[PDB]
Amino acid sequence: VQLSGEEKAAVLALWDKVNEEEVGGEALGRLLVVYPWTQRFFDSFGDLSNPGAVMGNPKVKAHGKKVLHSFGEGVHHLDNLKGTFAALSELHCDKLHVDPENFRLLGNVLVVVLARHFGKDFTPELQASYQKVVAGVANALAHKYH
Amino acid sequence: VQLSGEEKAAVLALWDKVNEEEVGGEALGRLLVVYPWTQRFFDSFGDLSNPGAVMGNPKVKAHGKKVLHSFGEGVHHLDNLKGTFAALSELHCDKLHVDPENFRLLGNVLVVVLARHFGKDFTPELQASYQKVVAGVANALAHKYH
Amino acid sequence: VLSAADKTNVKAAWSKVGGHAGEYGAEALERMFLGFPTTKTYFPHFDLSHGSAQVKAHGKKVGDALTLAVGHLDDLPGALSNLSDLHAHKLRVDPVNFKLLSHCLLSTLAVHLPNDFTPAVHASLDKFLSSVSTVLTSKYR
Amino acid sequence: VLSAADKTNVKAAWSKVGGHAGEYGAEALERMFLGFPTTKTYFPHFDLSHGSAQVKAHGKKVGDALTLAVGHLDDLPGALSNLSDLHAHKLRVDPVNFKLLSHCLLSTLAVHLPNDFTPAVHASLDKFLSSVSTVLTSKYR
Numbered sequence: 001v002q003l004s005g006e007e008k009a010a011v012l013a014l015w016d017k018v019n020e021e022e023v024g025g026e027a028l029g030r031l032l033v034v035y036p037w038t039q040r041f042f043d044s045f046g047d048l049s050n051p052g053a054v055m056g057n058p059k060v061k062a063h064g065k066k067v068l069h070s071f072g073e074g075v076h077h078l079d080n081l082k083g084t085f086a087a088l089s090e091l092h093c094d095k096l097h098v099d100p101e102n103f104r105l106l107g108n109v110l111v112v113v114l115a116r117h118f119g120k121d122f123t124p125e126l127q128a129s130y131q132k133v134v135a136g137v138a139n140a141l142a143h144k145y146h
Numbered sequence: 147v148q149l150s151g152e153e154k155a156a157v158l159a160l161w162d163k164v165n166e167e168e169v170g171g172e173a174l175g176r177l178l179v180v181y182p183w184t185q186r187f188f189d190s191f192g193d194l195s196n197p198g199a200v201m202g203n204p205k206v207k208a209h210g211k212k213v214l215h216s217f218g219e220g221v222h223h224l225d226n227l228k229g230t231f232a233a234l235s236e237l238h239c240d241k242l243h244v245d246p247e248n249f250r251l252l253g254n255v256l257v258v259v260l261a262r263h264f265g266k267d268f269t270p271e272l273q274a275s276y277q278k279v280v281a282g283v284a285n286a287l288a289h290k291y292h
Numbered sequence: 293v294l295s296a297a298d299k300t301n302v303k304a305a306w307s308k309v310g311g312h313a314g315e316y317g318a319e320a321l322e323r324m325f326l327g328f329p330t331t332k333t334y335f336p337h338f339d340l341s342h343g344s345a346q347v348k349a350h351g352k353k354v355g356d357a358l359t360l361a362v363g364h365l366d367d368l369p370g371a372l373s374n375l376s377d378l379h380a381h382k383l384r385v386d387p388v389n390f391k392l393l394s395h396c397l398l399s400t401l402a403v404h405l406p407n408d409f410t411p412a413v414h415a416s417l418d419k420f421l422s423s424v425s426t427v428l429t430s431k432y433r
Numbered sequence: 434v435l436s437a438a439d440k441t442n443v444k445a446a447w448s449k450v451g452g453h454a455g456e457y458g459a460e461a462l463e464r465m466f467l468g469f470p471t472t473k474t475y476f477p478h479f480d481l482s483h484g485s486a487q488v489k490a491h492g493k494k495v496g497d498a499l500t501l502a503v504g505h506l507d508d509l510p511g512a513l514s515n516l517s518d519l520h521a522h523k524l525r526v527d528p529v530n531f532k533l534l535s536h537c538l539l540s541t542l543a544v545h546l547p548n549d550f551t552p553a554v555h556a557s558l559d560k561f562l563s564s565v566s567t568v569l570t571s572k573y574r
């Protein structure tokens with residue numbers, strides 16, 4: 001990730017304010033609502049038949065929190081995203097066969113959620129750094145396809 | 147690139163029959179015809195205003211040959227695509243600012259051209275190996291964006 | 293909706309397919325399953341091996357739907373409405389996969405019709421397959 | 434063309450934009466130039482720095498075109514025909530860049546309208562921006 005020391009500091013400072021439960025549930029639920037094909041991977045999660053049901057689904061919220069926790073691991077290991085995400089790359093690529101384009105979509109949904117939560121504090125500069133982050137995470141997750 | 151020793155052998159065997167001039171001119175010209183936005187990068191090449199003009203343009207043919215020569219270098223350095231394409235990644239990313247999605251498009255156009263030239267000899271299995279190759283080349287070319 | 297020139301190219305090219313649309317659909321599917329293995333998981337109860345009865349059958353269906361689309365270029369949304377319901381609502385086909393199959397269809401046409409698969413015809417068929425893919429992903433809620 | 438429900442969501446959300454469309458367009462552009470620096474090369478003779486007169490002016494134009502699109506959801510091809518000629522024929526804008534700007538527009542709307550930017554509204558605005566992008570890339574020969 002082409003992140004400078006000063007950009008890195010700003011990225012970690014924002015994550016310090018991120019509630020992984022609320023932000024995670026919301027980002028995963030938005031993925032499922034905005035890009036409904038992603039629901040194919042979540043049949044076991046129960047009711048996903050409308051936006052209210054998806055957003056209010058306990059399994060969506062619980063799982064989104066776990067996803068965001070792993071994003072946080074990435075944020076705190078920017079110089080080794082490949083290693084950080086190696087196990088999850090095997091899961092998502094080799095076991096689940098998720099198209100890697102969707103890793104980029106989820107990263108961008110997370111960015112939109114951060115924008116919603118942080119408002120004007122989520123500056124164009126800070127968003128730019130987060131774009132580098134979510135691109136790095138998506139690339140690391142897709143390693144098993146490379 | 148997840149290419150086995152036997153796949154690798156088949157990939158190199160096909161390249162041995164590839165006329166980089168004819169295949170290269172044709173692949174670059176098809177890129178410019180099928181995805182006309184790519185013409186933005188080639189104003190100096192002169193007349194690109196219709197398919198006949200693009201395909202018959204000497205600068206397109208000359209440049210396509212150079213492109214295919216570099217693809218051939220990739221084919222012969224599959225275990226080090228990153229190093230092979232490092233200089234060209236700086237050119238295409240840092241100097242030209244080509245969106246990396248277009249590296250994938252050109253790879254796929256090349257695949258279609260190989261199919262056209264080789265017909266039934268370009269088997270589904272051999273195409274699959276070439277998909278791994280052109281994905282690896284695109285990823286290596288985009289390194290400066292990573 | 294495609295340009296008049298594109299429609300003409302597409303109908304012309306499809307005429308050169310002769311009676312091979314089903315064969316070409318089957319081969320395109322095989323190319324997709326091998327070139328892009330993620331796509332195999334949509335067909336869990338198919339024999340996906342070469343010459344498979346099921347792949348041959350399924351390629352005929354894809355070829356027949358494309359032939360129908362070629363005959364209905366002025367109203368792809370109407371012609372493909374039901375098939376779009378199936379692919380989106382029921383199958384939840386990732387839109388990326390339509391790009392993959394389209395690439396494999398172009399590859400297959402190039403294999404078998406090298407003299408007819410000119411740059412302008414390649415461009416028009418690409419637009420045709422994009423239009424078909426757009427309708428097939430249009431049913432997403 | 435968007436569903437009736439999507440059109441309703443889009444017109445509703447755009448009403449909440451109030452008189453801020455131009456401001457939001459400018460900010461979306463800034464987010465795009467910083468988040469996706471490749472896009473900067475389309476504007477070689479612009480001052481792209483924050484608060485730039487040129488970026489402010491240009492954001493007003495983008496916001497005005499989106500406002501016009503919101504008013505013409507039943508005929509985006511007609512409403513945006515000329516702008517599609519400009520972006521494709523003249524500017525040769527890579528279709529990828531429409532996805533980038535659309536993402537930056539959603540980001541900007543989320544910043545400023547957090548209570549209105551619900552999941553269903555996000556979905557409808559995404560579809561709206563996809564439809565606009567499709568028309569704006571439709572003029573490619």
Ligand code: HEM
Nearest residue numbers: 038041042066067070071096098102103104106107138141
């Ligand atoms: C791109 C960023 C993503 C990250 C960081 C991520 C992270 C994770 C994590 C941490 C787990 C939990 C493993 C465990 O606790 O057992 C998980 C599981 C899973 N992920 Fe993701 N994921 C991402 C994207 C996606 C996408 C785009 C999809 C498909 C649309 C997906 C589908 C799944 C599924 C189906 C599971 C297993 C759910 C189950 O237990 O049934 N992931 N992911």
Ligand code: HEM
Nearest residue numbers: 184187188212213216217242244248249250252253284287
């Ligand atoms: C993806 C596989 C590609 C490969 C292997 C490749 C390879 C090359 C090579 C070998 C050169 C020659 C450098 C030299 O001899 O000076 C070159 C130059 C160039 N490439 Fe590519 N290229 C690829 C894709 C693209 C794409 C997709 C575009 C834009 C649509 C592009 C735009 C250019 C331009 C504008 C030049 C310089 C032309 C000039 O001299 O004015 N390339 N590339």
Ligand code: HEM
Nearest residue numbers: 331334335353354357358375379383385389390393424428
């Ligand atoms: C050019 C694009 C495509 C066309 C014209 C097309 C056409 C068709 C047709 C005609 C059927 C038969 C429907 C029936 O049973 O009556 C079908 C079924 C199906 N398609 Fe597609 N399709 C396309 C792309 C895709 C893609 C990209 C995928 C996913 C990779 C896909 C996955 C499926 C699946 C899983 C079935 C059901 C198979 C079964 O279990 O019977 N299709 N399609």
Ligand code: HEM
Nearest residue numbers: 472475476494495498499516520524526530531534565569
């Ligand atoms: C939602 C999508 C977009 C809309 C609604 C939009 C709208 C507009 C409008 C209204 C204009 C002014 C035309 C005039 O001068 O009369 C314009 C110009 C322009 N647009 Fe866009 N645009 C969009 C996306 C993009 C993208 C993705 C790019 C490339 C990154 C781009 C690059 C340009 C450029 C280079 C100009 C001319 C600037 C100048 O030199 O004056 N646009 N656009």
Ligand SMILES: CC(C)(Oc1ccc(NC(=O)Nc2cc(Cl)cc(Cl)c2)cc1)C(=O)O
Nearest residue numbers: 352353356357360371372374375377378382
């Ligand atoms: C809700 C329901 C029943 O939807 C659907 C299920 C199947 C189809 N199939 C078709 O359109 N076949 C089809 C077959 C050919 Cl050869 C050509 C063409 Cl153009 C279409 C459409 C909708 C479901 O998903 O269960």
Ligand SMILES: CC(C)(Oc1ccc(NC(=O)Nc2cc(Cl)cc(Cl)c2)cc1)C(=O)O
Nearest residue numbers: 251254388391392395418422528570571573
């Ligand atoms: C977007 C626009 C204007 O033009 C375009 C039409 C087609 C393509 N090609 C593709 O993306 N192919 C493609 C092929 C593969 Cl194997 C994988 C992937 Cl990920 C993509 C690009 C642009 C349109 O929609 O008409």
Ligand SMILES: CC(C)(Oc1ccc(NC(=O)Nc2cc(Cl)cc(Cl)c2)cc1)C(=O)O
Nearest residue numbers: 493494497498501512513515516518519523
């Ligand atoms: C061939 C030619 C002259 O084409 C064109 C050049 C400019 C435009 N601009 C417009 O549409 N502006 C515009 C401005 C606003 Cl605020 C809103 C909307 Cl909806 C549109 C369209 C076509 C060229 O590229 O030189």
Ligand SMILES: CC(C)(Oc1ccc(NC(=O)Nc2cc(Cl)cc(Cl)c2)cc1)C(=O)O
Nearest residue numbers: 105108387429430432529532533536559563
């Ligand atoms: C294809 C289909 C059916 O749905 C979709 C609509 C939107 C998206 N999102 C994007 O791709 N965003 C996106 C955002 C960025 Cl920052 C970069 C890139 Cl490369 C892509 C995905 C699918 C449609 O066209 O309607």
